[PDB]
Amino acid sequence: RQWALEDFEIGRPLGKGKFGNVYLAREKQSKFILALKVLFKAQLEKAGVEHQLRREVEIQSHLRHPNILRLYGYFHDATRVYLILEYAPLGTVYRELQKLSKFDEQRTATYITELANALSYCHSKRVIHRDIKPENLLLGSAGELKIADTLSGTLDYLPPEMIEGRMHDEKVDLWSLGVLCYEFLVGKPPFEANTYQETYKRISRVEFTFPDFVTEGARDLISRLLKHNPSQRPMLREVLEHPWITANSS
Numbered sequence: 093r094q095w096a097l098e099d100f101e102i103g104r105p106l107g108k109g110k111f112g113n114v115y116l117a118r119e120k121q122s123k124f125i126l127a128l129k130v131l132f133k134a135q136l137e138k139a140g141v142e143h144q145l146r147r148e149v150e151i152q153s154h155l156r157h158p159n160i161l162r163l164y165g166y167f168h169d170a171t172r173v174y175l176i177l178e179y180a181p182l183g184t185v186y187r188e189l190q191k192l193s194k195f196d197e198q199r200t201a202t203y204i205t206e207l208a209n210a211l212s213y214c215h216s217k218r219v220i221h222r223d224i225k226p227e228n229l230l231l232g233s234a235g236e237l238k239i240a241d242t243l244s245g246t247l248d249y250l251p252p253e254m255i256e257g258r259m260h261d262e263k264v265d266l267w268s269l270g271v272l273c274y275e276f277l278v279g280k281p282p283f284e285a286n287t288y289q290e291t292y293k294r295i296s297r298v299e300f301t302f303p304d305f306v307t308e309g310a311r312d313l314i315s316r317l318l319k320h321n322p323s324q325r326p327m328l329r330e331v332l333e334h335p336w337i338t339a340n341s342s
């Protein structure tokens with residue numbers, strides 16, 4: 093079964109995004125509340141992402157999980173493309189991260205625990221994320237996490253394998269998991285530069301430092317999650333189980 097724009101009431105705008113926007117919405121028959129993404133053809137077919145759209149849509153469509161934002165369906169109108177998403181009633185993780193300095197140890201750890209379950213499961217559907225970052229980590233009405241998937245974007249997030257030219261198997265997500273578990277605890281991603289240029293130089297060689305206020309326990313996890321050669325990085329089992337993790341993961 094498919095859908096149409098008239099089926100929904102286009103309420104208030106949630107985020108003034110990239111390819112268009114995302115709005116609050118409700119299906120009339122069902123009275124079901126959700127988020128709706130209006131993005132134009134004339135937008136994606138004008139950087140080239142025309143195919144790579146309908147691509148990851150289905151990649152997502154068959155997928156279901158509690159720390160993964162569901163897609164409920166999709167469709168197109170006169171001009172544009174529409175994405176019928178889960179609604180995450182507590183906004184972006186970013187929204188929270190800015191409004192606070194950083195996250196307290198307990199909170200960070202639970203956000204990582206959840207991101208494991210969701211990737212550990214996601215690694216068994218033969219799907220990898222590249223750029224999972226907190227512009228798109230959302231919170232459910234119970235306050236817990238929900239992933240919502242030379243010039244490109246900031247790359248504080250992509251591993252050295254994604255920019256040296258090397259191969260990128262399924263242990264990408266461990267890099268990202270470290271980078272984030274850092275950001276959550278420190279305030280900035282650990283490869284912040286004001287030029288793309290150092291950022292590149294600083295990732296390839298793994299160049300970062302920890303403020304005083306970081307437990308040796310965190311530095312321990314982060315350190316062994318941020319390794320140049322993907323080989324030496326743990327399976328996501330070792331992670332969920334890691335000492336510092338399960339000490340304060342609510």
Ligand SMILES: COCCOc1ccc(Nc2ncc(Cl)c(NC3CC3)n2)cc1
Binds near residue numbers: 107127181184187
């Ligand atoms: C003081 O600021 C008020 C907070 O405003 C909110 C913004 C966003 C949500 N949740 C939300 N749910 C689902 C999606 Cl798909 C989505 N998309 C995000 C925009 C990319 N955002 C809730 C509240």
